Amino acid sequence: SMFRYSNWLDKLYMVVGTLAAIIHGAGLPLMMLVFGEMTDIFANAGMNLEEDMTRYAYYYSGIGAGVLVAAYIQVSFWCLAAGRQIHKIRKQFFHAIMRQEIGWFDVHDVGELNTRLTDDVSKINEGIGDKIGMFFQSMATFFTGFIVGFTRGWKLTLVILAISPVLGLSAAVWAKILSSFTDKELLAYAKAGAVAEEVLAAIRTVIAFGGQKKELERYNKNLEEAKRIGIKKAITANISIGAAFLLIYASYALAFWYGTTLVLSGEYSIGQVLTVFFSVLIGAFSVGQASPSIEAFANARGAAYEIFKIIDNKPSIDSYSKSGHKPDNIKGNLEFRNVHFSYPSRKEVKILKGLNLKVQSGQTVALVGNSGCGKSTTVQLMQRLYDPTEGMVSVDGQDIRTINVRFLREIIGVVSQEPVLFATTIAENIRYGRENVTMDEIEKAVKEANAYDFIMKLPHKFDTLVGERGAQLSGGQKQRIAIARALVRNPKILLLDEATSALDTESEAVVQVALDKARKGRTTIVIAHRLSTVRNADVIAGFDDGVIVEKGNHDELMKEKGIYFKLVTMQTAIPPVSFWRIMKLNLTEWPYFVVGVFCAIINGGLQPAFAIIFSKIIGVFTRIDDPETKRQNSNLFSLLFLALGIISFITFFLQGFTFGKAGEILTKRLRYMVFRSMLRQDVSWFDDPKNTTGALTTRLANDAAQVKGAIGSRLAVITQNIANLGTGIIISFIYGWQLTLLLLAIVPIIAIAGVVEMKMLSGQALKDKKELEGSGKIATEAIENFRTVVSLTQEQKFEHMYAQSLQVPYRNSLRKAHIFGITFSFTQAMMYFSYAGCFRFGAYLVAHKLMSFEDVLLVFSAVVFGAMAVGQVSSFAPDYAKAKISAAHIIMIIEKTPLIDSYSTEGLMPNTLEGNVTFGEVVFNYPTRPDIPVLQGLSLEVKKGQTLALVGSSGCGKSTVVQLLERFYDPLAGKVLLDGKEIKRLNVQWLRAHLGIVSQEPILFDCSIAENIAYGDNSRVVSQEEIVRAAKEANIHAFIESLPNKYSTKVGDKGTQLSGGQKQRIAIARALVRQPHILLLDEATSALDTESEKVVQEALDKAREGRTCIVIAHRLSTIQNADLIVVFQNGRVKEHGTHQQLLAQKGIYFSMVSVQAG
Fold first, then answer.
1. Residues in binding site for ATP
2. CATH fold for the domain made of 1-153+738-850
3. Which CATH number fits domain 917-1154: 3.40.50.300, 3.30.420.10, 3.40.309.10, 3.20.20.450?
4. For residues 430 and 445, is the Cβ–Cβ distance under 8 A?
5. Which ranges carry the ABC transmembrane type-1 domain?
């Protein structure tokens, strides 16, 4: 944990900040000591009083100024030192990641790299910024507090020390354990909700069958127990918190009793008692305040170690290094010999087993071979990207390794299969090729690559802003631009990989002509699938399983009848925010909240009750009578204090009982309500990219707590704080008339200052986030195409871009640090000086006999303690903004009425079904991509007992038809009828029950085989004999038989417990169980063997009679028995009719069938 390597001029910043923070922390206990001295001075008094009060107030103001100075110095120094450190770390980190060897990058993930390039830096910054400063401040407060206590009196010091902090630590540990238990209960809820997770994940078939009632019943069965557990946990947590508060109050009361008894004996001054007590208590509370900084710093240390791992990792090849020979005389010559190499990504497979190949200057060498023969890897290694596992490469008689890497990379050009261009102007991207680039050279290169026309025609001929990831220009345009950029380098070696991949005939010809016109300038190597480009290849070598076998000219290669000849022959072939409707929803539990409001009011009054009790107890030493009765009276007061705790304890409990239940209860209702809509939604909404599978479940889960908080805790905190403030104000006015106004004017000023400080911190954090995210996006664009960037050997350019982009946010952060320090120190000093001025004004009022000092102490303590209590208890409640957002989102989701009224009872329920389908002029475009129409007013007419099948190009409409059958997506325009009944008019439930489908990827519910099989129907029990019959019909009669416990075996996640074929058979049986009049199978043969597929098809055909059968698969023989076969070409019914008719009239069907011809 020593990741703070300074610059020998920023270390002093940290040291000064630490010292100033220590002084600041010692500050407040000094204020308490001065306060005690002032109180004792008055009691001695109980004019001279005015003079003494002014002297004490001037002491106070002096220490206030010192505190302001120390706070500003410490906070500013720490923040700016951390800014310096984090900026240096960002720069060095990007330097290293850029300099890291390419292999190390290929091994590592990129998403993690990019994510930690920003988030990790942000974390380490947030953990080393000032929280260390605040931790030093708290520790200094604690040390100074006990220092003062010991210097004043050991008796009370030890008494308070041995009692208060042990109880405080116990209460804190209890709260932490309660938080852990609450997290465990949330995990139990998640176990319960796994049911909804599974149901929604497979919601497709669930909706298809429409058996939603059972799922909802099971979910409620889970939710009842979840709610019981939550209510118990909340009750226990609230009880424990109340008990801890009561214990702390009792300990403070005991401290007061001991001190009062001692002073009545005459040990220490009455004011001294308060001084020592407050010193000890504030020291303990300060140690309590120090917790978050240590945890944040530990997390920052972990992230910093993660970053330093990459930062200090020396690479194999130092691209950003000047070392290495830099020959000037360049003659094209290379010679690889026994170059065995294995990609480090998968060390097992040795892609390069060794070979021999030598090329002289201006020699065209081509690689011929199948995929993986050793061409792509050979090209990649050509640029020394991966050091060979075994080989001796020499260029122009000189080993590659000895020469400097930078020049070696800069003296070679490579055109990739899909070369990219940085997100700038095309001229800019070309300029990236070399540091020095002239517009004349750019024009010459563009003309050479036949890119001048494409650049000139487009807007801003030489300024077009390439779309993000090259989304604007054409692929051929990108290839030509890359070719021109590479030619700009004018290297001594040229490489080309899969140039024809995307290139069209004209594009490929242009690229080949450009390459040929300049190949004479340096040795060139090309690997492509267009053997015609290899027809002119001066020299061709055939990569054979990592070994080059064929070698010779085109004529010699053809004559040899080898790999080259075989290849030649083969070639010859946003959410609308809602204001308060949440309360409208919560209103249903009206009587469960009023008691909570009363309890909150009781507690809010009790807090000023404690303030006034303390005031009276202190004032007990504000009379000259000095009777023993005072002792008793004091004792009496002490008793009330303890009673004050008890009244609070039960009070607090009520809140948990009053709110918690209504809270948890509310969630329960919400969880049932929201899910009610979640199940009743169209498939499209789930298909929405916003949230499909997990985001929705997580939304519901977090929303439970969010909405519970927003409804309950917001009202609780608001009412309690308002009651506390009002009670304090009323008490002050009753016991005050002049200082009351002073406090009511000052303290809210401090409150506004603190709120403004928090808001400024949040806003500045967000602004810095965005400003840095600019350069972060720049860096992401850099790393994403890391291969090309490293190939261009221009990492220095991207690093300069990064530094330039970060420079401005750096100074922005420094200024923001000054501002944050100013606000923090100003708030501290303003609070304390307001306290001092209130003390002075009260002294003036008392000296003139305006109000008894007991009244002054009462009013001041009431106001300050009310403010502090509201400021501390306002922290407990959950973040109201996130809850607001979640509640609005839920109110949005819940009211989204689906287009197909699944819940609504409207529709028609014909008694008898015939099994006729007729769609005509029905055109539909998937709302996921409304621009692209997949249904174009097609036609289809199937009569009773007509077995139909559909075929065509993959993804050419063979799929969406089935979904159109189940009304999961209605048509944009046209007519659809089932047995002459408007599919829209007919009831969704009736039609869904009547029909049935067989998915290409069958889904089995995570339950017993018998349970899932019976699930095929709803509200209808199928006899176990029916289960056995279905299993036999699916060939799983024996599989059903075994099925440990007969029909019990619980399927795994995604049906892993059973085989794929067994799963398909089980799904077929489940579909058949319901006995639908129409059965639609879509890719039912997606995974089947001879026996299982044959059995399924034969059973379907034999049971086809009396029902409609639709098949969407690739089995031509299966369609042979099909009554009718239809071909869908690009969403149009092209070939339709009998198999014999289709074969007689040659066409798409003829070619499709003959593709399997011998």
1. 369-376, 952-959
2. ABC transporter transmembrane region fold (1.20.1560)
3. 3.40.50.300
4. yes
5. 14-299, 593-882
